[PDB]
């Protein structure tokens, strides 16, 4: 599906998860300053590739980049 | 004689065009009495049309087989002849005015980079500063060359690139 990656450039703002419309990525241990979280993509069978998580990520440069791959029923948002 | 073109007085087509224009003007000029306003308007129009055709034919401008004037833009053909005004001096006049404009705008946009929130000064200009710089740029060739020898216009490679 959509190969999603998360680089070390991250602050753990918890925003790319309260913005993702498909609840695809999680945030489990990271050693930060005040919040100490890092994003991760444990599952991708439901990720559509809307690039809504890349808009809210304030990291420069972005912490997450969706490598566009192949399409499916979930990836094409098909109710039929 | 250059490029097979002939001076524009000896052009039968040019005089034929002038006569055509005058006939076309007079045919509808004869519609009004000599006292009304439209008649005076057409009279003045014919005045400056005849003036067009008379004043062009001085110091030499070549008209071709079509009788219309043709500008010579090569320096060297405008020299060795009398055509330096066709387009040779207008080039320098535009260069002067464009310099003037760019110099003033650059010195403005530079002198505003020092104060807090310069963006405001780009939507709410400093009218007195712009007027001052507007009346100080008519020596810009002097300031440009020596500001170039100075080095105060080359940025020492401290800008944003990607490669």
């Amino acid at each position: 599906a959509h190969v999603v990656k998360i680089y070390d450039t991250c602050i753990g703002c918890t925003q790319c998860v309260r913005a993702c419309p498909l609840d695809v990525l999680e945030m489990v241990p990271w050693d930060g300053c005040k919040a100490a979280q890092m994003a991760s993509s444990p599952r991708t069978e439901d990720c559509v590739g809307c690039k809504r998580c890349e808009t809210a990520c304030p990291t420069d440069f972005l912490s997450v980049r969706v490598y566009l791959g192949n399409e499916s029923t979930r990836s094409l948002g098909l109710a039929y | 004689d250059i490029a097979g073109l002939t001076p524009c007085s000896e052009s039968k087509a040019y005089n034929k065009l002038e006569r055509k224009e005058l006939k076309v003007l007079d045919k509808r000029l004869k519609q009004y009495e000599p006292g009304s306003a439209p008649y005076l308007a057409l009279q003045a129009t014919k005045e400056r049309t005849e003036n067009r055709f008379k004043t062009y034919a001085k110091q030499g401008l070549l008209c071709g087989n079509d009788g219309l004037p043709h500008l010579i833009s090569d320096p060297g053909l405008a020299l060795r002849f009398n055509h330096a005004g066709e387009v040779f001096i207008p080039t320098f006049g535009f260069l002067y005015v464009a310099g003037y404009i760019g110099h003033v705008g650059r010195q403005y946009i530079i002198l505003s980079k020092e104060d807090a929130k310069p963006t405001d000064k780009e939507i709410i200009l400093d009218v007195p500063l712009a007027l001052k710089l507007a009346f100080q740029g008519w020596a810009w060739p002097l300031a440009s060359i020596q500001e170039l020898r100075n080095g105060s216009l080359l940025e020492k490679d401290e800008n944003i690139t990607v490669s």
Partner: protein, 739 residues
């Protein structure tokens, strides 16, 4: 119902101007990007985006209304003053048959004075196709000395209008209780603003019908005509002109309306010599309108237990299928201004187009039927205004549905029932548009193929195989036999477009009956196709705005957004704003087709000059066997009629060709925006900014490319601009050289 305003709600000061974007706290912080300016411009009027204070929003709207009417009045005053100072209105008035209207004279600078076309009347200038001289002739104006004072009055009224706007915004800002008086707003718009105005204008037309009907149409010079005040007061004059006067005004007290027949007359039609209509018919029509709209504004309970309010009427309308309908539509309207605006613009543009249709075939003025240019101009103008108004109603419907809507208090079973089958409508209208496209456009392909294959006897034609309509012809038959059979007291039919009697004024036929054949059948099917496709676009934009099948969380993204993301194969042009974007293009297409049909019909089968033996039209009846093929529209209409626009450099019509080419230019320029994106442009701006920073001349404000929504906006703007401007130049340079 009462009045409720506040004193000095916002102090008058030039401070809030020094901070552009104050109304948007996001913009007021400062312009750190060049997008700030474009958002300043695109949001200044977005009153419901400034704050959620609907009281302040209603105050802003009620002030912007005066702000618009002030410009309207200054515009009318400018027209009147152009007519007064520099124009041939006296010359036109002494000889309307051949002298052409001109009210704009250019300045002699670079040869532009050639535009001062020789129009006669001892004066030269630019010919005007607005229709002000014919409108002024119906008011007894005899000299230029009156238009000056009329413009003075108009300008004073415009100043007072801006005064009232400032007064009701900064000194008498109302409250939502006053704005939401639907009862008062109706009973004062419907009864007062409409009824009183109609009665006043009818009384005006009654006491001004002396010059136009009798003196102006008797060769009497306007200077010779006694002034209107000399007609109003002197009873001997109005007794000599119309015997029904000086009776004693008795029939109007006892309502014995029997003697008033010289000034309230019902004739219908017009004399093939007088050119125009009569003022008595318009006076009677305006009295009918006054009485009707004055009685209609008295059917609502306001204070004294007389009538019935709107809420009870909405509550007492329910049926088996829907059930509990019209629950909160009164609140729908009283809550949001966008709902009222969309509902208004819904039929406002439609009635504008209906006014166009009622003006082209029913010229309500004297000495303009022979003026073949003003009719086309006004018709096309009003049709494009109506198209824009309809598309704007479609946009404001979704606007209402986005910000000011919640199905809890404004709940209505009607709206939710419409929503619950929001997909069957779209699917069936898709199928119907496919039907019409294969059955209204494919016919032209068949006709071209048959004419090309060398089989003219197989092509669709009024001679080979007829496909003309009869229902419209049956309507024309019911209207033709209406006099003396279904309309006893009537004299003539509804219009001379289906009743023969070729009326001609000075060679030029003022009106000739319009035929309806296979060509009109095909073109009306094309019109229905285009209109249905436009309605499809607009409605599919309006409905799929709160929710959809793909993205459920669509309401939070707002009304004005380009997309959601390249996911699920790609999402582009999903917002209702983009559906309005496409509806603008479809409205362009439909209105253009309709106006070309109008022009070519009027020039082929209607207009012309009458000789001793019949009438010789402009074109040799090229409408019959050219409309049946797409090539015909390029065979005898577009190719043939474009000679003047490209051949007008020798005359005062060269500006028309200049606008022609410039509109082509701006059209392709719009194509530029429509076919490109931002990535390329943003990176090109990046390299240009690099070039700048080498000499230290870049701006402090970050130069960014236009927003995607603004990119599409500029695209559609230039596109419609170029299109409408080219068609304007064509229809306005072609019709001057043939009238």
């Amino acid at each position: 119902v009462k009045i409720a305003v506040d004193r000095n709600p916002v102090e008058t000061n030039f401070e809030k101007w020094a901070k552009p974007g104050h109304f948007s706290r996001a913009l007021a912080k400062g312009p750190n990007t060049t997008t700030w300016i474009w958002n300043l411009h695109a949001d200044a009027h977005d009153f419901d985006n400034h704050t959620s204070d609907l009281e302040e929003i209603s105050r802003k709207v009620f002030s912007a209304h005066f702000g618009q009417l002030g410009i309207i009045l200054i515009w009318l005053s400018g027209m009147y003053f152009h007519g007064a100072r520099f124009s041939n209105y006296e010359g036109w008035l002494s000889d309307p048959t051949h002298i052409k209207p001109s009210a704009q004279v250019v300045w002699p600078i670079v040869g532009q004075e050639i535009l001062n076309g020789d129009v006669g009347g001892g004066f030269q200038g630019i010919q005007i196709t607005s229709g002000f001289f014919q409108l002024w002739r119906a008011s007894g104006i005899t000299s230029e000395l009156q238009l000056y004072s009329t413009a003075i009055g108009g300008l004073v009224l415009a100043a007072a209008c801006f005064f009232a706007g400032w007064f009701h915004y900064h000194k008498a800002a109302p409250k939502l209780e006053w704005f939401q008086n639907v009862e008062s707003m109706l009973n004062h718009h419907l009864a007062g603003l409409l009824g009183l105005g109609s009665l006043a204008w009818a009384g005006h037309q009654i006491h001004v019908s002396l010059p136009v009907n009798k003196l102006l149409d008797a060769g009497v010079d306007p200077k010779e005509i006694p002034l209107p005040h000399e007609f109003l007061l002197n009873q001997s004059i109005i007794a000599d002109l119309y015997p029904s006067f000086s009776k004693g005004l008795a029939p109007f007290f006892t309502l014995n309306w029997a003697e008033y027949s010289d000034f309230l007359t019902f004739k219908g039609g017009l004399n093939p010599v007088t050119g125009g209509l009569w003022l008595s018919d318009t006076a009677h029509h305006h009295l009918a309108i006054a009485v009707l709209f004055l009685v209609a504004g008295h059917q609502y309970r306001t204070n004294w237990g007389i009538g019935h309010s709107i809420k009870d009427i909405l509550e007492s309308h329910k049926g088996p299928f829907t059930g509990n309908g019209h629950a909160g539509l009164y609140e729908i309207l009283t809550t949001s201004w966008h709902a009222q605006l969309a509902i208004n613009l819904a039929l406002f543009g439609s009635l504008s187009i209906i006014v166009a249709h009622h003006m082209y075939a029913m010229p309500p003025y004297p000495y303009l039927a022979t003026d073949y240019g003003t009719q086309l101009s006004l018709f096309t103008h009003h049709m494009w205004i109506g198209g824009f108004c309809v598309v704007g109603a479609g946009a404001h419907a979704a606007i209402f549905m986005v910000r000011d809507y919640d199905p809890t208090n404004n709940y209505n079973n009607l709206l939710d029932r419409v929503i619950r089958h929001r997909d069957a409508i779209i699917s069936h209208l898709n199928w119907v548009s496919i039907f019409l496209g294969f059955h209204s456009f494919g016919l032209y392909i068949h006709n071209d193929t048959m004419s090309a294959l060398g089989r003219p006897q197989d092509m669709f034609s009024d001679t080979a195989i007829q496909l003309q309509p009869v229902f419209a012809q049956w309507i024309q038959n019911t209207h033709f036999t209406a006099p003396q059979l279904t309309a006893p007291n009537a004299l003539a039919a509804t219009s001379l477009t289906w009743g023969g009697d070729v009326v001609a004024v000075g060679g030029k036929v003022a009106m000739m009956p319009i035929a309806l054949g296979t060509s009109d059948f095909l073109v009306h099917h094309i019109h229905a196709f285009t209109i249905h496709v436009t309605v499809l676009i607009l409605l599919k934009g309006v409905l799929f705005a709160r929710s959809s099948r793909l993205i459920p969380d669509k309401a939070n993204l707002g009304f004005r957004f380009p997309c959601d993301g390249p996911g699920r194969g790609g999402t582009c042009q999903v917002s209702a704003w983009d559906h309005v974007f496409l509806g603008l293009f479809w409205m362009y297409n439909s209105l253009s087709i309709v106006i070309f049909h109008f022009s070519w019909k009027m020039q082929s089968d209607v207009w012309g000059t009458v000789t001793d033996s019949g009438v010789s039209h402009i074109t040799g009846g090229n409408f019959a066997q050219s409309a049946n093929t797409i090539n015909g529209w390029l065979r005898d209409f577009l190719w043939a009629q474009s000679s003047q626009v490209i051949q007008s450099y020798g005359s005062a019509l060269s500006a028309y060709g200049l606008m022609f080419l410039g509109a082509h230019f701006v059209w392709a320029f719009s194509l530029m925006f429509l076919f490109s994106g931002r990535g390329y442009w943003q990176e090109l701006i990046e390299s240009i900014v690099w070039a700048h920073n080498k000499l230290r001349v870049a701006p402090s404000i970050q130069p960014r490319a236009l927003s995607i929504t603004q990119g599409r906006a500029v695209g559609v703007a230039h596109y419609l601009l170029g299109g409408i401007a080219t068609t304007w130049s064509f229809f306005l340079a072609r019709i001057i050289a043939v009238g």
